[PDB]
Amino acid sequence: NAKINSPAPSFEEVALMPNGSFKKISLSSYKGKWVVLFFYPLDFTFVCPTEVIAFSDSVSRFNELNCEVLACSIDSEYAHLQWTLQDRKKGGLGTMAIPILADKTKNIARSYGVLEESQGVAYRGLFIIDPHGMLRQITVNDMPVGRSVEEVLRLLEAFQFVEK
Amino acid sequence: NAKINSPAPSFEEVALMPNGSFKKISLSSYKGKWVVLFFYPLDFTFVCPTEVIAFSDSVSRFNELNCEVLACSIDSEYAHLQWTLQDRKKGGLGTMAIPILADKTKNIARSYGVLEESQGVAYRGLFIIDPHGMLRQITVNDMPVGRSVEEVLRLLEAFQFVEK
Amino acid sequence: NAKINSPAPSFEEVALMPNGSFKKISLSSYKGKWVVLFFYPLDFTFVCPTEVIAFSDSVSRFNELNCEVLACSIDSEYAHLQWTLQDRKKGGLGTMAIPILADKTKNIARSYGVLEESQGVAYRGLFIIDPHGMLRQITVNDMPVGRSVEEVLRLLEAFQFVEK
Amino acid sequence: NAKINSPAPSFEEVALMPNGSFKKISLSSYKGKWVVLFFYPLDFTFVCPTEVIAFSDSVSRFNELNCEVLACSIDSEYAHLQWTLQDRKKGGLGTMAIPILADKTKNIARSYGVLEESQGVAYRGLFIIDPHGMLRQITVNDMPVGRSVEEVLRLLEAFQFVEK
Amino acid sequence: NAKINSPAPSFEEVALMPNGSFKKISLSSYKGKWVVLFFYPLDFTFVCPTEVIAFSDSVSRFNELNCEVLACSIDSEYAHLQWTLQDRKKGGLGTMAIPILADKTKNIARSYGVLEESQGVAYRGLFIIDPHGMLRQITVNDMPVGRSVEEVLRLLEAFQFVEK
Amino acid sequence: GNAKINSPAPSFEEVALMPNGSFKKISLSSYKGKWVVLFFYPLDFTFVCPTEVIAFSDSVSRFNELNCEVLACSIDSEYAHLQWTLQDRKKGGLGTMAIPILADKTKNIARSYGVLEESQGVAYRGLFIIDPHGMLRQITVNDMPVGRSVEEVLRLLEAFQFVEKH
Amino acid sequence: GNAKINSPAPSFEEVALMPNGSFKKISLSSYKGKWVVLFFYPLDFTFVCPTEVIAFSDSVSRFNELNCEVLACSIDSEYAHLQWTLQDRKKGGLGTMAIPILADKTKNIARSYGVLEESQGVAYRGLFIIDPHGMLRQITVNDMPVGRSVEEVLRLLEAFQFVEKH
Amino acid sequence: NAKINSPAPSFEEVALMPNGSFKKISLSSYKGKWVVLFFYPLDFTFVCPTEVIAFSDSVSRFNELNCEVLACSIDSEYAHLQWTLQDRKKGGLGTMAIPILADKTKNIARSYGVLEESQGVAYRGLFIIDPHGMLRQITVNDMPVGRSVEEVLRLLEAFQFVEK
Amino acid sequence: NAKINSPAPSFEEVALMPNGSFKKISLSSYKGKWVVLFFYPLDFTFVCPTEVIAFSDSVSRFNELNCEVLACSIDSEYAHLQWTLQDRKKGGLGTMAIPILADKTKNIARSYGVLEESQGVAYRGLFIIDPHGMLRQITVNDMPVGRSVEEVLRLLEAFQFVEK
Amino acid sequence: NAKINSPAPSFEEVALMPNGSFKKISLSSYKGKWVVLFFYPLDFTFVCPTEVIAFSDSVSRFNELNCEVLACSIDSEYAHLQWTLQDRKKGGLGTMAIPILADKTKNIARSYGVLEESQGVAYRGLFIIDPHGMLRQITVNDMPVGRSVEEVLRLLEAFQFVEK
């Protein structure tokens, strides 16, 4: 389970890459970089996916801070792909600048302790992981409330300021 | 688990209705009718979903034999809905004449013993259930091979013939 | 128990050979060939044995597809033999072109999960096993309904088409 | 398991009746009479079935002593029937003057502790049971050696002489 | 332990009141109001307690939203009191407009899963609890990075907007 | 009861009254290479005139010329057994014997052969045929009041040996 | 061993050879209201001339006039016991006895009194003094080859009864 | 615990020596000699200590038979000493010709199974041990009844006569 | 075991009364009074008994403060008695003004956690118990160092001052 | 736990040094010296901390007896520091001549068995430890009653006198 100042739970799982391909991604492959790993409940929700899009539209701000961003849900990689092929205007995801993990077994959500067991979907959890793979901050929102790109960046800069 | 001449495993779960709405469906609500419950692995797969469509195109042939047909997968109801909104020509599902269960918790697949745990997806299992809710026949295919609408009908007629 | 894409349960047991002799047969001796292993409840049933005969009459069609066929029941090898010595017109089996396993311990039925424990007899289960010894499809019928030689051949071609 | 001066293990099972019909028979239905229950391994064995026949040819001798005799094996009732329809001269059983239990589940053999677990067949066990349902004597032979009708009668008379 | 959409872990503990008195406070006494419960590591840290002060300076903004705010640490109520008697200029806490729980047994921190067991102090955890006592959002920061009053208010308004 | 057909007959090494009147330790394995008829009886000095035990003793040679040794057993001490043999046959005693009699003082032999009546502390009239390989080949158990047949055991022996030959 | 000083002596109900020659069930509790000397010995018909058991039988009245009953016990059957009494005293037998002899066929009595030699299946020369209330009051246990003293047991009895009085 | 023909329970403990000194004494130091080890309840009991004295007055009789005698109780060595300094006429012990063990831990009494647990004192137990350290006879008296020096000597001579 | 502000461990045990008689004394019989219960190792020690005597010589000072004093050791009541009959000049105890418990089972020492298990004797433990039977202070000395009557009185007054 | 004549429970913990710095201190670092380790409940209590001050004012008296003195409580090192910065006249601690352990995890209190679990604070326990690290005396007071510097010195001198 996920704990501050302990190594963030490991995973190696299929993800939809920004280019549209499927690829296995391990957490340890990010060693040497900061990582913002964030979960969302379901693809194709009647929610306007503004939240997932917001993070994708902002990758480079995180990148300038040596931070990679990674999305995740219990949906398949095909579901992910289909959502990106769908129009943003029509409620789709459109192009993504970040990978989206396909947590098909729900185990990543489980290890990060964000799985709603009765629904089989993940809460809006977000985790900041340092270059050493250490879990440094936990944010978990109930389904109906989104996270803030600004806030995560606030936190990132703060953490990096302390390291300097 | 699913055993011949034992009551078929119970379930009550959200499904995508033929009209496009979401609805809770219980197995017991079919008491008095035959049921063909069949699983498939994933929505939006790169296999043209001929198999699921074949069963939908043939409901009537089951229906006049006092048999209801029910599809199921580990995908969400929103995923299901999205697939039906997708054009059949374009590898989508198009309109569906049968309900599709959203086994988001994988428990239905588990109880029917068709779940591939490592994958998180169900095998191509099909189950014939009588008006008394008794499991009467088991078919399970490996992912790459489809089932036969003709065969299931053969079996149905055979079973009903034995009742007279 | 038996599972798709797991090695099919092992066995080494006495069988009635097509020539009329008794012989020990192991599953692994079929490595390199496809196998259709199928169970039936009892020898000498008041149910005419059209089903078992149908598979025997069709061996070559299976053989041409690099597939061996194997029958099985809880009856002794002597019971098997006696049934083949009985005239086909008289409700007997006649000369068989396939071996018939004598599952006297009922353990083969048990491992394939087709044993009706209260009766001590096997359900009409049929299993397709690949040249690697991997279980590839499961069919189980309630006692009163037979299987289809055509259907098994349909699946066999389908499976081989996927490899080629 | 079966113990001297304890109630003989209960059973209710299908048997081939002397007239050729199938019938459920319980041990307790013999209360008030002595019973010689005896097991044999298999129907249709290559060795002339003189032993089973010997007991059938002698029923009236047992009946004279208020004793009923009951045969048993792991074979089905249909196997039993078929053996009696077979000519005695030809290695068959001919019509029998005693019922033959069809211990399909093997449980009767198990409870009397005569089941060879590796073979799935019963040893040549014979049990004398009194009118009170109490087990009074145990005889168990290895497969290749038969029992003696004279001896069982010796024992019967001895037991009845003591109760006199 | 603390879970989204489950009742927030109960507590009744001594707290330093804004007026300077000690008082037992239970979580359930806030039923009917929103609660922001937030932990901090230690009193008298060489950190300028800007964070704890920031929340105190902002109580009325939370109050206008029907939300009460509650601070907590493993320090005694006397330690709390002493810190408030200390000058803000000298690194003290000065006057507080919010109560500060004295989690002397560390059990509140434990139940909210924010206790650093090796240090015996709590991480910078913050929890939003609804009028029904249900846990609605989790924020946990590593020691050196503070939380944002603005962000918590963002979240509060969002939650209340959904309820309307 | 450990006593199972086609399994090695339960082992034992115990004091026995020898035909000559001496006490001697006897193990089952010492009979390897010979058939053995091991038979139990309830008690020495019983009010049942001991014809059964005597019958087997009077017939040893018949067993012996079948390459079969015969061995009696009961829960009584070796001294009890000896006393019984010193007692006159006419007078309800045993007389001198042609077979050894095991003194199953711990009752464990009877236990391992599953013939011990636990409430009484005595053995049922159990008889066991053991082959030259030490394998248990046939089980006979009688309730107390009914005896076994020397003829029958010989019938069985010949039958078993006939199967070995052909 | 359940046998503890100032605890109720271990219960039993078992067949015994009565002084008159009959078999009878005897329970410990049937002696309530009397002192009891219960004593064990290893085996009937031993090559030890049975002076010890005889000594206690020859002295019953001495125990009796102390309101004390005496009871012998061994793992031998009641038939063994009877046979021994039918045997002539001169000839190494027991002769007719003035005390009952328990037939501890299941060995449980010896077990509960903690005097059973498990490897031999026989009891040590244990002797137990039990009061009218059924309470165990003294324990004597001898190795096989050494006998007990009738005088000593009487010494003990008088001592115990003297303490009751004054 | 102590058993006939098993090695007598070991001990090494302080004892009051006949000369008035304290000394550690082990059971094994008597190997090669017979030992009469005997327990008594308490020092300074209101009843004239004739029993302990009787054994002391008779040591040479035991010594003649290559037998050493050893007294024991739960009292301290100082208690023992004090009792011997007390005048025999006055209810005291006087100087003893045998050692008296000070079983302060109660463990010797425990291992010889003579400890009255509720009182914390030992029963009047006496044990005869051979030159090989084997326990050869057990005598245990209830508190109010003494043992006999004559009897123990009777036993000793008997045992030695047998080994002769 | 014994704990501050928990009821002091119960006991009912024989004690040597100041008048020279034996009497059962329970802790609860002191309810309504303060109690100083103190242990010492052994009677008749080569260590002059100044400590035990000091407390006896001072009873009244304790009594005036509504406090009873109680001595205890693992020695028998007869040992106690004998020590008091011994002349104080001669290393004896003399007439005592306090009762002395005879903890023959060592259980009182055990429950107060002052038993030296290897020696079977108690450490120089002293316990102050209030009128409610609550344990209020613990003093435990290693064998060679005595306690102070003054100190115990200092504590007693202090405790009573806090109630008044 | 803390037992007389057993090694005193080990610890290594942060302490406030007399100079005002924080430093890790282990018990074993005192090997070769006597140690008076004493606990108190809480910093900033409304009791004028005369007791802790009394020991600090007297270090020298311990020091010349080759004895180091060590204070301890469950409060943080920062709490300790703050209390020493507070004016003695104002109920503060003022300058301290002894180190004060910060038992933030309450484990030292636990191992010395002085912790009041419900409170989360330690009782007024004091422990004398010899140069060999052996626990030699235990004093435990209920919260409202203080210990005596004189008494501890009495004990120290007594212990050292026994060593010569």
Numbering used by the authors:
A (entry chain E), B (entry chain D), C (entry chain C), D (entry chain B), E (entry chain E), H (entry chain B), ...: 5 to 168
F (entry chain A), G (entry chain A): 4 to 169
Copy out sentences from the published article reporting this entry, exactly as the authors wrote them.
Leishmania reduces the hydrogen peroxide produced by macrophages during the infection by means of the tryparedoxin/tryparedoxin peroxidase couple. Two enzymes, i.e., tryparedoxin (TXN), a thiol disulfide oxidoreductase, and tryparedoxin peroxidase (TXNPx), a 2-Cys peroxiredoxin (Prx), exert a concerted trypanothione peroxidase activity analogous to that of mammalian glutathione peroxidase alone. The two enzymes are potentially suitable drug targets since they are both necessary for parasite survival and absent in the human host. In this paper we report the X-ray structures of cytosolic TXN and TXNPx from L. major.
LmTXNPx, cloned in the present study from the LmjF15.1140 gene, belongs to the Prx1/AhpC peroxiredoxins (Prx) subfamily, able to reduce H2O2, organic hydroperoxides and peroxynitrite thanks to redox-active cysteines. In particular, LmTXNPx is a typical 2-Cys Prx and forms an obligate homodimer, whose active sites are formed by the N-proximal peroxidatic cysteine (Cp) from one subunit and a C-proximal resolving cysteine from the other (Cr'). The structure of LmTXNPx was determined at 3.0 Å resolution. The crystal belongs to the space group C2221 and the asymmetric unit contains five protein molecules (A, B, C, D, E), modelled from residue 5 to 168 (4–169 in A), and 64 water molecules. The LmTXNPx subunits, as for LmTXN, are associated in homodimers (α2); however, they are arranged in a different way. In turn, LmTXNPx displays a decameric assembly both in the oxidized and in the reduced states. LmTXNPx was crystallized under reducing conditions which stabilizes the FF conformation. Interestingly, in all monomers of LmTXNPx the LU conformation appears to be predominant. In particular, both the locally unfolded (LU) and fully folded (FF) conformations, typical of the oxidized and reduced protein, respectively, are populated within the reported crystal structure obtained under reducing conditions. The B-factor analysis performed on the LmTXNPx structure shows that the mean B-value of the whole structure is 36 Å2 whereas the mean B value of the Cp loop (residues 49–54) is 60 Å2 for the A monomer and 45 Å2 for the B monomer, indicating a high mobility of the loop.
